[PDB]
């Protein structure tokens, strides 16, 4: 009894108090602001929702019996908060928290408000240990939310519901089927994108793609023809994961040129927060695909504390691939195949042999000028000299090297191509970035004039000084 009298009492009052201005005041201001004005995003308090989600994530009977049927009930809500606090201080409070929104005069008269209120129970119920709020009961609460979803008037409800049917997906993600979630999402997508433009063409796309790939079906038809590619309103958080998904989709189909740029943009759109969960994966792929595309080094050495422990296999891998040796590649694959399979990346790196052999032959071509093929096999350990002829021939085909070969003799001789400065390519190289440096100036200037505003102050010299000047001039002209 003595132990629980000094640290247990504090938990009750202080969190309630600091919540009274965190979500109670937030709800009160949103009701008269989001549902009281057309500021939308401004008075929608999506960042207040954000903060009250992130803080409560790492953080109900009183707040569920909120009443606002009449003005006295709405006024009462706030004194009833203190009344329930006093009851909690004196007495011990408590399914029976789902019928209250239909009772206790609960007439918010704003869907934007009752939605967030309902979702707030769902988030704790989702995070109620691993119980899943008695499983389907959380889903049933979200089934209630889905009934609310069909309620209507979306000058706020839309951007309120986004988060709702984003956690809704997580509910099934942690449990049972997802196929019928896909059916629902497909329907909901055209339920939107038809009410002119309403957004959600960002969140629903990511929700659909999150486990479309996880089920391991690489359908792409609708992605190339999707009209929701361009919501243009993503808060710079949705856009990153959307670009990541489309980049992996593009890269898995033997397309490397565009995936690098799009997914590098996606990675560099990532925020500054300490969490590095998805950045681990995007980095890992962003350097596998760069190894695949030609032989760009990618070895922009990463030793940051967060990423150091994870990417230890990959460092060893790049070490083998950069050199022309091939036994090292097998000695790495047979060692880390299971680890790569656990990462879902065995299929991409299993086709890396061609890149290794291209690097080796290019290095051999650049180093020597006249070498017998009776040693190329020994240096690259192909175990046979005759097929080295075919390998070199294929290399010459694609313009890898311009060396000729005397088949009757056996030695390979290479041409000499120097003085690239006179070639037209450096002009192209300069132009490609002249374009960028000209674009950035216009981009910067475009947004400079937005902050200058409220400059109504426009006065020249005076108002009544003109009469004094005229009088002085007349007096001077009189004499």
């Amino acid at each position: 009894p003595p132990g629980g009298g000094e640290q247990e009492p504090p938990p009750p009052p202080a969190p309630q108090d600091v919540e009274m201005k965190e979500e109670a005041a937030t709800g009160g201001g949103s009701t008269g602001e989001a549902d009281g004005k057309t500021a939308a995003a401004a008075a929608e308090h999506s960042q207040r929702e954000l903060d009250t989600v992130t803080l409560e994530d790492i953080k109900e009977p009183r707040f569920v019996l909120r009443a606002l049927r009449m003005l006295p009930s709405t006024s009462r809500r706030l004194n009833h908060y203190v009344l329930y606090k006093a009851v909690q201080g004196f007495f011990t409070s408590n399914l029976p928290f789902l019928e209250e929104p239909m009772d206790t005069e609960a007439d918010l008269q704003f869907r934007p408000r009752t939605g967030k209120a309902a979702s707030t129970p769902l988030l704790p119920e989702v995070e109620a240990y691993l119980q899943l709020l008695v499983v389907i009961f959380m889903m049933n609460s979200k089934r209630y939310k889905e009934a609310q979803k069909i309620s209507d008037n979306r000058r706020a409800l839309d951007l309120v519901a986004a988060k709702c049917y984003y956690y809704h997906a997580r509910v099934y993600e942690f449990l049972d089927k997802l196929d019928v979630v896909r059916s629902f999402l497909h329907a909901r997508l055209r339920t939107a994108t038809l009410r002119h433009d309403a957004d959600g063409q960002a969140t629903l796309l990511n929700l659909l793609l999150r486990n479309y790939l996880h089920y391991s079906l690489y359908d792409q038809a609708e992605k190339l023809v999707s009209k929701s590619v361009f919501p243009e309103q993503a808060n710079n958080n949705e856009w990153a994961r959307y670009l990541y998904y489309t980049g992996r989709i593009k890269a898995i189909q033997l397309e490397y040129s565009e995936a690098r740029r799009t997914m590098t943009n996606a990675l560099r759109k990532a925020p500054q927060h300490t969490a590095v969960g998805f950045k681990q994966t995007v980095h890992k792929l962003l350097i596998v695909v760069e190894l695949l595309l030609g032989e760009i080094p990618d070895r922009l050495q990463f030793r940051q504390p967060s990423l150091k422990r994870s990417l230890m296999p990959y460092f060893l891998l790049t070490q083998a691939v950069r050199t022309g040796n091939l036994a090292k590649f097998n000695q790495v694959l047979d060692q880390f195949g299971e680890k790569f399979q656990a990462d879902g990346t065995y299929t991409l790196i299993i086709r890396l042999r061609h890149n290794v052999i291209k690097t080796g032959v290019r290095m051999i071509s650049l180093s020597y000028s006249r070498i017998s093929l009776a040693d190329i096999a020994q240096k690259l350990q192909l175990d046979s000299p005759e097929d080295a002829e075919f390998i070199v021939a294929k290399a010459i085909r694609d313009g890898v090297i311009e060396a000729s070969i005397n088949h009757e003799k056996g030695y390979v001789q290479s041409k000499e191509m120097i003085d690239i400065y006179s070639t037209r390519e450096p002009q192209l190289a300069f132009h490609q970035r002249i374009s960028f440096c000209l674009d950035i100036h216009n981009m910067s200037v475009k947004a400079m004039r937005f902050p200058p505003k409220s400059y109504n102050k426009d006065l020249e010299s005076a108002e009544e000084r003109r009469e004094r000047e005229q009088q002085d001039l007349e007096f001077a002209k009189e004499m």
Binding site: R195, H196, D197, R449, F450, P452, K453, Y455, D458
Partner: protein
């Protein structure tokens, strides 16, 4: 009735209007200064 059709049309027009209004409000200032 046919209210839904009319709602759709009027809503689309009003949704467009605001962007234009905004992109003109900035333009007026420069000229004034």
């Amino acid at each position: 009735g046919l209210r839904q059709y009319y709602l759709s049309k009027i809503e689309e027009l009003q949704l467009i209007v605001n962007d234009k209004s905004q992109n003109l409000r900035r333009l007026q200032a420069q000229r004034n200064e």
